[PDB]
Design a protein around this ligand. Structure first.
Ligand SMILES: Nc1ncnc2c1ncn2[C@@H]1O[C@H](COP(=O)(O)OP(=O)(O)O)[C@@H](O)[C@H]1O
Ligand SMILES: [Mg+2]
Length: 434
DNA sequence: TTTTT
């Protein structure tokens, strides 16, 4: 509906050039424009996103769940990690007929995921000569929002010598196709609070005086119990503690879903709580996709019935009831063996638990992309990722709806240099690799 | 530290 939305819709549908990017600050309407691209490209297009919450918000699915990529480092063009589907599988028949791939929240898309989408699309359509196999890809997202996640294994050494960085614009595909950049400026999520919107405009460039304005405006440590509030917190275990304190305020019998952890599985890598106490009405979020498709990762809901090795959840999207059973997680580490310059994956331990965690309080990574009614930001040991603070402050429409526990220190205004070179070289309208 | 199955 917006002008820059309508002009970005046209610049993307009216030209047959693949590799477009529609970027802009948070709440400018990228994902809403995607809903319009979906109506334009009905049935011709698949909508993907890197995260489960962002995928549901965009009315699509995660990139891994579509291509069936393993949840590990997708080595460059490596047939052990990236594998094309079967000769007459229904996945194959979807890649072949499709012509548009809409990829939302492109900023959280790690370079190895994008480079795997390229190769996977080349091999299945057997156009190994053409980027993305001839699919017209439409990227949407923001690079000043959260960076892609890199675990401290040899994966970070593999990424740093094959791409030199984890961001999607460091993928080697951009040396074969130029990326066309369309920009949105005027904010729509915060169209009601213009000064909140422009406070957030100067915060995304890191204006320090625009931050002391924030610390005296929106600090209400008591902000965590006004009903209708969603608590954002950086670290997962911090969210566990806040979740349980709200959980003890419900008049139901609790169930303790003890996890069967095994092998060398660290506690810091725990997807959900190990003990995971849950009551008959708790607000949960689902962490794994249903092999039958009635629920997905990132699905918010509330418990209705819970039992020994299963429980039922009312999903908030469709208002329907699902029953979840314990999925099994597994930890992958990358070992340098043999004394050859090739690393190889290994599984060192499993974590069998019900794919559920409480969601009175959520991480910030699972909040990116969402429009929330009311948010309280509880800073634990602090901010550790790039764009993590900007994401937590932009989920609301009015400042009135945002709450801080402590005043932010400029200490927490992280920033990557790879992003500034990108944001500077796309001022021309194009990105082809340096 | 955080995501993805
Ligand atoms: N043209 C528009 N008119 C009215 N509201 C809009 C418009 N575009 C977006 N919005 C609203 O702004 C909110 C944020 O939009 P969203 O698509 O999330 O932007 P982004 O994906 O860039 O964060 C949504 O709740 C939506 O209703
Ligand atoms: Mg969005």
């Amino acid at each position: 509906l917006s002008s820059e939305q309508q002009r970005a819709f046209l610049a993307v549908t009216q030209t047959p050039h693949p590799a477009h990017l529609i970027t802009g600050p948070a709440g400018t309407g990228k994902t809403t424009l995607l809903y319009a691209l979906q109506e334009f490209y009905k049935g011709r297009a698949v909508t993907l996103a890197p995260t489960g919450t962002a995928a549901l918000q965009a009315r699509g699915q995660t990139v891994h769940s579509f291509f069936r990529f393993p949840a590990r480092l997708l080595r460059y063009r490596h047939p052990e990690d990236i594998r094309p589907p079967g000769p007459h599988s229904p996945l194959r028949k979807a890649i072949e007929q499709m012509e548009v791939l809409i990829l939302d929240e492109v900023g959280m898309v790690r370079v190895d995921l994008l480079e795997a989408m390229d190769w996977a699309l080349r091999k299945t359509r057997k156009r190994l000569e053409e980027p993305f196999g001839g699919v017209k890809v439409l990227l949407l997202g923001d690079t000043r929002q959260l960076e892609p996640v890199v675990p401290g294994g040899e994966e970070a050494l593999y990424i740093a010598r094959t791409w030199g960085g984890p961001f999607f614009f460091q993928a080697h595909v951009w040396e074969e196709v130029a990326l066309r950049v369309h920009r949105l400026w005027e904010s729509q999520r915060q169209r009601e609070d213009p000064l909140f919107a422009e406070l957030l405009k100067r915060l995304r460039q890191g204006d320090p005086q625009a931050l002391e304005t924030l610390n005296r405006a929106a600090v209400r440590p008591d902000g965590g119990e006004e009903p209708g509030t969603l608590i954002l917190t950086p670290r997962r275990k911090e969210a566990d503690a806040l979740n349980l304190k709200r959980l003890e305020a419900l008049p139901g019998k609790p169930l303790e879903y003890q996890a069967q952890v095994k092998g060398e599985f660290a506690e810091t890598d725990f997807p959900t709580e190990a003990a995971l106490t849950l009551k008959k009405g708790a607000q949960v979020i689902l962490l794994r996709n249903d092999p039958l498709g009635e629920y997905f990762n990132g699905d918010l809901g509330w418990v209705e019935d819970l039992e020994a090795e299963a429980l039922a959840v009312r999903l908030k999207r469709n208002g329907r009831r699902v029953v979840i059973r314990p999925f099994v997680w597994e930890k992958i580490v990358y070992t340098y063996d043999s004394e050859r310059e090739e690393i190889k994956p290994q599984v060192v331990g499993t974590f069998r638990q019900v794919p559920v965690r409480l969601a009175w309080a959520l991480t910030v990574h699972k909040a990116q992309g969402l429009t929330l009614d009311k948010v309280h930001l509880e800073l634990g040991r602090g901010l550790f990722a790039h764009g993590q603070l900007y994401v937590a402050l932009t989920r609301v429409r009015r400042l009135q709806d945002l709450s801080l526990s402590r005043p932010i220190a400029p200490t927490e205004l992280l920033w990557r240099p790879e992003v500034e070179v990108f944001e500077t070289r796309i001022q021309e309208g194009i990105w082809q690799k340096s």
